[PDB]
Amino acid sequence: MYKIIGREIYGKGRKGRYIVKFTRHWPQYAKNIYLIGEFTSLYPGFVKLRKIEEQGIVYLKLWPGEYGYGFQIDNDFENVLDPDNEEKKCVHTSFFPEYKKCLSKLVIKEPDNPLDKIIHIEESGFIHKFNGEIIIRLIAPTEINEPLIDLGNEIREPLTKHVVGDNIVYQYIIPSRSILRYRFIFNYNDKKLFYGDEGVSENSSYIVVNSKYIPGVDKPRWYMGTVYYQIFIDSFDNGDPNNDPPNRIKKTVPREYGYYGGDLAGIMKHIDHLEDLGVETIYLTPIFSSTSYHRYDTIDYKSIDKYLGTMEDFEKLVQVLHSRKIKIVLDITMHHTNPCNELFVKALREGENSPYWEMFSFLSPPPKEIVELMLKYIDGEECRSRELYKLDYFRNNKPFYEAFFNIWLMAKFNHDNPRTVDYFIDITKFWIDKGIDGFRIDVAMGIHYSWMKQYYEYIKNTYPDFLVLGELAENPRIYMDYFDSAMNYYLRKAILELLIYKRIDLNEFISRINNVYAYIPHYKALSLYNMLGSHDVPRIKSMVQNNKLLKLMYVLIFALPGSPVIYYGDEIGLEGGRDPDNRRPMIWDRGNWDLELYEHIKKLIRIYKSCRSMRHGYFLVENLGSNLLFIKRWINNEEIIFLLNVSSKDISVDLKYSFDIYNEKNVLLRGYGFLILGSKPCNI
């Protein structure tokens, strides 16, 4: 059940988001009820209903639109429809946009009075600082002419406009001042109206904000626009003969499941390739103590997995990387852990009623023979939890605790218990003391929003330069108060639905993009982890099977504000289907490289570095008809444009910029073709 309660009110009458109350019956057996869907998380956990009497409740603040949602009770991933809602919305999932999932339909209707669709509220997406300037945004419908911003002393025009559905988001950028006073002027039915503190009226008051309280930064952090490189460590390379494990897979092509033997030395010996490619930040697959080649079931968050090397190999790696001005981010599983984890073994020992029990989300205490059995395999100098699968009970029954898709070896932490926060904070310090520059939080969207607020706020206070990057699948505008960055699976899905599944047109795509970009602060957008591929999805080349289109997708990834990502090997044309086939050994024989793609990507990176307007840089996007995508990025005095032909059909382009940034030199673009132009070479 859901009820639209009304709208939030800012100032003395400015209406904001719609307050929606979510209710469900609370079955007496239920331990947890998650609100899943497109405004919380599809994997359960970001938001929980809270229990009062015989029902679960929560209030959210949402924008108009149509959304899929549901309620997941405990470990039942299948049945999530809202029992009170008869209506359904089948949403294409993020990682695999071919597959639909049918959820319940929430619709929040646009208001009748177009005057009610004018919005500017005191929140970071609407007002924030960057580069010693203030960014202000006004949402208005088309029946409103281009509104002006009335500062104290002057009147300015919107510097850009972003289409979002039938709405327009006007963006004003202004110099910074001590106190800040602004309102908006527009014409409606041939009448002169204002948007001010009490809302729309003939003479609205100024909105007043002390720059002290405007969120943002002056000079961007390293992570606010950086080039990522993800390495799945097991598959990158073997540097140390004495690091190989028992029985190694075979480079057969359908990559098998298991250990190939890649280690820290292996990466370290290919620093030269990292450098030549030009990546700035390396994101590493989990390297902690574990029982699998993938290592997403960690035993001990403070020890390097034996097959990878020693703490010393690790520090050496970090050191070389830093000496080349390359940073390192480690993958960390703050959602769940291997049952061999000391805490889980103690929780089992001590039983419920123990503070140890409360570190995890146990469901219902099972029989004692079971616990003793498990304890036989999980307590020991050696972790033998894999052997659990040799037993019938473990292959047959779901875990008696919550776990990642009910997988025995992935026991979920109790995120309602602040002790678990302390645990991961302490772990964070340990690794900061090893010189790492950031964490990528595995299954971030399954971690309760309050937990992440505790963690993120504290880390950010204590270590401002520590990147907090989350694995998140839904619209990043949901999450950016809790992370520096999100792996942008949302953007990836939009690109694929425009250019592969051909399910949306160029306008809808533009709307998808601005539905993220216009609702978050510019610095947040710049930090977004913008990837075409990852260890969780098939290789992009194998999905595109089109040289020119693939190159186009990379151009797009570098043109949109964000932190462009390269999954290891994608730069040379590594192919592969779905996991595990998407983690084939890197190819070190240059005779087997797709060199055109390689040099293409290397150039896009050189531009990213040379052109501060590509890296940092305000953003405008226009559909110039005929499937001509126009993108403009600019910062301070530096200007750069991108013309992209998003179709197979050649198109004639005409026309400030007389310098080829891509080719350097100084028309008619062919299908899938593109142009990158400045008014001269980039400088600083």
Which of 197, 214, 231 represents a domain boundary (last residue)? 214
Amino acid identity at 648 = S
Q: For the chain, give the number of residues.
A: 684
Residue-by-residue DSSP string for 148-201: EEE-SS-EE--SEEEEETTEEEEEEEEE--SEEEEEEEEEETTEEEEEETTEEE
Q: Give me the torsion for CA of 299, 576, 555, 513, rounded to 10°.
A: -60
- HEC per residue, 266-288: HHHCCHHHHHHHCCCEEEECCCE
Residues 107 and 138 in one domain: no
Query: Which of helix, strand or coil describes residue 432?
Result: helix
Q: What is the DSSP letter of 20?
A: E
The SS3 of residue 34 is strand
Residue finishing a domain among 365, 397, 414: 414
Distance separating alpha carbons of residues 93 and 101, to the nearest angstrom: 7
622: containing domain? 618-684
CATH number at residue 369: 3.90.400.10
| 257 shares its domain with 290 | yes
Residues 195, 279 within the same domain: no
How many Å apart are CA 54 and CA 127, to the nearest integer?
41
Are residues 182 and 206 part of one domain? yes
Read off the DSSP letter of residue 29.
T
Buried b (16+ CB within 10 A) or exposed e, 625-641: eebbbebbbbbeebbbb
Q: How far apart are CA 540 and CA 464, in angstroms?
A: 34
Cβ neighbours of residue 276 closer than 8 Å, sequence gap 6 or more: 602
Q: Are residues 72 and 122 in the same domain?
A: no
User: Do 555 and 683 sit in the same domain of this protein?
Assistant: no
Could you give the CA distance from residue 489 to residue 501 in angstroms, rounded to a whole number?
16
| CATH number assigned to the domain comprising residue 49 | 2.60.40.10
Non-local CB neighbours of 437 within 8 Å, separated by 6+ positions: 222, 281, 327, 328, 329, 465, 466, 467
DSSP 603-633: HHHHHHHH-HHHHS-EEEEEE-STTEEEEEE
Residue 333: CB partners within 8 Å, gap ≥ 6? 286, 296, 297, 298, 442, 443
Residue 484 CA, distance from chain mean position: 9
Residue located via tokens 């997708």:
553
What the block records as the tokens of 336 is 């769940």
Last residue of a domain, one of 93, 117, 141: 117
CB atoms within 10 A of CB 461: 8
Does residue 388 contact residue 348 with C-beta atoms inside 8 Å? Answer: no
User: Structurally, how many domains does the chain consist of?
Assistant: 5
On whether both 272 and 313 belong to a single domain, the answer is yes
The reply to whether 298 and 362 lie within a common domain is: no
Question: Do 488 and 355 share a structural domain?
Answer: no
CB 204 within 8 A of CB 194: yes
Contact 112, 143 (CB under 8 A): no
In the chain, after which residues does the backbone break, taking C–N over 2.5 angstroms as a break?
Answer: 655, 666
Same domain (yes/no): 501, 485:
yes
The method recorded for this entry reads X-ray
Q: Which residues are CB-neighbours of 86 under 8 A, at least 6 positions away?
A: none
In the block, tokens 């992440």 appear at 452
The answer on 601 and 469 residing in a single domain is yes
Give one DSSP letter per residue of 283-346, joined into a string. EEPP-EEESSSS--SEEEEEEE-GGG--HHHHHHHHHHHHHTT-EEEEEE-SSEE-TTSHHHHH
| Other CB atoms within 10 Å distance of the CB of residue 319 | 12
How many Cα atoms sit within 13 Å of 518 on the Cβ side? Answer: 27
67 contacts 38 by C-beta, under 8 angstroms: yes
Measured between alpha carbons, how far is 222 from 212 in angstroms, rounded to an integer? 23
Q: What is the CATH number of the domain that holds 651?
A: 2.60.40.1180
What is the Cα–Cα distance from 260 to 494, expressed in whole angstroms? 34
> What resolution in angstroms, rounded to 1 decimal?
2.3
- Is 119 exposed, middle or buried, given 0-12, 13-18 or 19+ CB atoms closer than 10 A? buried
Strand pairing partners for 401?
362
Specify whether the CB–CB gap between 329 and 438 falls below 8 A.
yes
Task: Note whether 431 and 530 are same-domain residues.
Answer: yes
Q: Are 484 and 327 in contact (CB under 8 A)?
A: no
DSSP 3-state of 235: helix
On whether the CB atoms of residues 616 and 635 are closer than 8 A, the answer is yes
Mention every residue, 6+ apart, whose C-beta is less than 8 A from residue 144: 114, 118, 186, 187, 188
Distance CA 292, CA 73 (A): 29
Give dist(CA 544, CA 547) in Å, integer: 8
Tokens at 396, concatenated? 């047959």
Residue for token pair 């290789």:
539
Torsion angle in degrees (nearest 10) through CA of 285, 291, 292, 293? 60
- Calpha distance 526→222 (Å, rounded): 11
Question: Would you tell me the crossing angle of helices 489-499 and 506-517 to the nearest 10 degrees?
Answer: 170
Cα 646 vs. chain centroid, distance in angstroms? 24
Q: Terminal CA-to-CA distance of the chain, rounded, Å?
A: 55
Here the tokens at position 49 are 């209903």
**How far is it, in rounded angstroms, from Cα 30 to Cα 56?**
10
Q: Please give the backbone phi and psi of residue 359, each rounded to the nearest 5 degrees, phi first.
A: -75, -10
Contact 353, 313 (CB under 8 A): no
Report yes or no: 55 and 28 within 8 Å, Cβ to Cβ: no
